[PDB]
Curated annotation (Swiss-Prot), chains A, B:
The enzyme contains a high proportion of positively-charged residues in beta-barrels V and VII (compared to the homologous regions in other triose isomerase sequences). Since 2 clusters of positive charges located at precise distances on the molecular surface are common to 4 glycosomal enzymes, it has been speculated that this might represent a signal for entry into glycosomes. Substrate binds at residues 10, 12. The active site is at residues 94, 166. GO terms for biological process: gluconeogenesis; glyceraldehyde-3-phosphate biosynthetic process; glycerol catabolic process; glycolytic process. This is Triosephosphate isomerase, glycosomal. Pfam families: TIM. It catalyses: D-glyceraldehyde 3-phosphate = dihydroxyacetone phosphate. Keywords: Gluconeogenesis, Glycolysis, Glycosome, Isomerase, Peroxisome. The lineage of its organism: Eukaryota, Discoba, Euglenozoa, Kinetoplastea, Metakinetoplastina. It comes from Trypanosoma brucei brucei.
Length: 249, 249
C-alpha cells in the first residue's frame, strides 16, 4: 500500500500579498478528508505572511531553495536561517535552478544532504530535458541524478527525503506526462532506490510527479502504482490546487 | 559639496530573528545628527521582521538581490514582489553574485535598469579583483562595469542610482583600501560619470566605498572627496555600524 501522499504547491517566483492571501484563505476553507501532506513553497519574501495566515492543519510551509550555510553570500538564504524561521520543508534541485542557476547534480546533492542534516523534509527534484528524452537518455539521466543525491546521504536520511520527478518538457508547457510515462519513470526510480538503498526505504519513499499537473489530469496520474503525489507549478496559484489535493486517493 | 551620504548595512546571508532584532533595537536607539540615508539590506526571509521592527526614521529596508520579473524562476525573488512588499531599495551586482552566481556586467546592468524602471533606489556594486588590481587593470575593469550599467539607463535615471565601489580584494579579507586607494577609484568613477553622463549627475551621485569598512577606519575614508558613504559587510552585524553612520557627518 502507498505511503502518505504529498500535494505540494510550488508558487515559484509569483504572488502579491493580496493574491497569495486570497489563495491561502481558499486553502484554509477547504475540507480535506484523507491523509495527505499538503505543502506550500512560497518565495522567501512571503514566508512570514504564509506562516502567519496559513492555518489549515494538513498544510506545511516550504522554501524553494537555500544554500547550506550562512555567511558572505549576498542575496542568498541559508538552511540555518530558514530553520530559525520555523521553515521545515524545502524544495531543492528544481529544474529551473539546474538550468538557470548553475545547480549541477552534485550541487543539488550537497544541498539536499545539508538540508536533511539540519532536519528539513526535502522535496528533491530530478527529471530529464526534452533533448534527453528525445535522445533516449531518460533512464540514465534520472538514475544519475538520484545516484548523485544518494552518494551524499545515509540510509537513515531517506526518511526525510521526497523525490519529485518532473520531466522538463512537461513543466509549464501544457504537455503532461501520460500516466504510463509517469509510472515508467517512477517505477524506474523506485527500482533504483530499492536496490541501492533498501526495499524498506523504497516502500516508504514518496515519488511525486510534476509538470503540467492540473485538476483534471491529477486523478488518473495518482492511480498509478508509484505516483505518491504531485509537485504543482502553475495550477498551485489557483483554486484548482484543491482539486489536485483531492485527487491523491 | 557632497550629496546626502548613505550608510548601508549589507547583512549578507546572516542573522537569526533574535540576533537581528537586537541589532535593530540598537539602531532604533541611535541618535543621528545629520542627513544620512541608513539602509539595512537583510535576507529576503527577514524583510518582514526588519520592516516591522525598524522604526528609526533615517533607516530604510533593502533587498540584496532580485530578478527582473515574476514567473517560473523557482527560488528567486522578483522586483515586483519586492515592490509589492514595500521594499524600495536594493543592492545589485554584489561581488559575491558576480563571482558565485553568474552575474556578468550585462546581467547586472539589466537588473539595475529593471530595478530603476520599477522605482527602486539601487546600490549597484562594481570593483576589481586582486589579480586585476595587481596587473594594472583596475581602471578598465571598473569603468567597463559602470559603462555596462550606463548603457541601459537614461540620464534622469541616475537619480535612482548609487554606486558601491568594493574592491573584491577588500571584501572580508581585512584588507581595507587605504584612503588614497579608495579616493583614486572613486575619483575615476566620478570623472567617468561626469564625462559620460553629466557633471551635474556626477555631482549628485553617491559613490560608496565597501570592503572591510569598520567603525575605526570609516572616518578616514569618509574624509576623501569622492566617498559618499559605505556598503558595510561584517561590521554591519555589529554595534560599531553606529560608528560608521556617525563617520558620515
Amino acid at each position: 500500500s502507498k505511503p502518505q501522499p504529498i500535494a505540494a504547491a510550488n508558487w515559484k517566483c509569483n504572488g502579491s500579498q493580496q493574491s497569495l492571501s486570497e489563495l491561502i484563505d481558499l486553502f484554509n476553507s477547504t475540507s480535506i478528508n484523507h491523509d495527505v501532506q499538503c505543502v506550500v513553497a512560497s518565495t522567501f519574501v512571503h514566508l512570514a505572511m504564509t506562516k502567519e495566515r496559513l492555518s489549515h492543519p494538513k498544510f506545511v510551509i516550504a522554501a524553494q531553495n537555500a544554500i547550506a550555510k550562512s555567511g558572505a553570500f549576498t542575496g542568498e538564504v541559508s538552511l540555518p536561517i530558514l530553520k530559525d524561521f520555523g521553515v521545515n520543508w524545502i524544495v531543492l534541485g528544481h529544474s529551473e535552478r539546474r538550468a538557470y542557476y548553475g545547480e549541477t547534480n552534485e550541487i543539488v546533492a550537497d544541498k539536499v544532504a545539508a538540508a536533511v542534516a539540519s532536519g528539513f523534509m526535502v522535496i528533491a527534484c530530478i527529471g530529464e530535458t526534452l533533448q534527453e528524452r528525445e535522445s533516449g537518455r531518460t533512464a540514465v539521466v534520472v538514475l544519475t541524478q538520484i545516484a548523485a543525491i544518494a552518494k551524499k546521504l545515509k540510509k537513515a536520511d531517506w526518511a526525510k527525503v521526497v523525490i519529485a520527478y518532473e520531466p522538463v518538457w512537461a513543466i509549464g508547457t501544457g504537455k503532461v506526462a501520460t500516466p504510463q510515462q509517469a509510472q515508467e519513470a517512477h517505477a524506474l526510480i523506485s527500482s533504483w532506490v530499492s536496490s541501492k538503498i533498501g526495499a524498506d526505504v523504497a516502500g516508504e519513499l514518496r515519488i511525486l510527479y510534476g509538470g503540467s499537473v492540473n485538476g483534471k489530469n491529477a486523478r488518473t496520474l495518482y492511480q498509478q502504482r508509484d505516483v505518491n503525489g504531485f509537485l504543482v507549478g502553475g495550477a498551485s496559484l489557483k483554486p484548482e490546487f484543491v482539486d489536485i489535493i483531492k485527487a491523491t486517493q
